[PDB]
Symmetry: C2
Subunit: 128 residues, 2 copies
């Protein structure tokens, strides 16, 4: 009926927690529409992201604020996440661990069968 | 117990529906903390805003989207409001009516007694236009 914070949190965990670029596709696939999945994969294929495959690794969701608009199933999320930046692929020598990062997004959910799925995602800015 | 959309809406009406600058102070004062009230009045006294006193009038809240973080008592609001824009001050002759405007805010509420009060307010940007290109560094 109503979109709950539990559903949003499950998506944030899958979307922000990954060993490497693309390693979480199988875990966010059941939580998003087919259109959204294709869009997320195409974002991963952009040069700015492909460039760091194997170099930015072991990323985990750290903190989150979830702001739900229950009348249109839109959500604002304000997240921090931590990762390791390696200097050499597959090698932890020289790596910077536990590097903090911040991002805010607007998510649109749709009901598809029994489940709420992410159908749209856009960046927003919550700072000043 | 939990911050509700009814509480947020009551503040939005008090903050956005006014006949002129400062005219709504008595309606939003009980809905905000003492510190917030003083900040709001000082923002109103800035020459940026005082310049439109007597020109921008008959303002009404129109559409609103209310995003509530019930764990942190924080709210994002995305609002449209309509007003009349006068060409000559204190005179409706030649004014533009039903002019649309948009604003998005982050509101921080505190529970003071049994009531939720606005304690902080900050602008945010939620729109497509201002954001990044996808193949860009954050």
């Amino acid at each position: 009926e109503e979109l709950t914070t539990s559903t949003v949190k499950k998506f944030l965990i899958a979307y922000y927690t990954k060993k490497d670029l693309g390693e979480n596709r199988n875990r966010y696939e059941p939580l998003v529409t087919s259109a959204m999945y294709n869009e997320l994969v195409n974002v991963e294929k952009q040069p700015v992201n492909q460039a760091y495959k194997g170099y930015v690794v072991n990323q985990v969701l750290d903190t989150y604020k979830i702001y739900i608009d229950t009348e249109n199933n839109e959500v604002i999320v304000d997240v921090t996440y931590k990762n390791t930046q390696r200097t050499k692929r597959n090698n932890d020598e020289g790596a910077l661990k536990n590097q903090s990062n911040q991002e805010a997004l607007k998510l649109t959910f749709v009901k598809q069968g029994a489940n709420f799925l992410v159908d749209k995602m856009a960046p927003v800015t919550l700072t000043n």
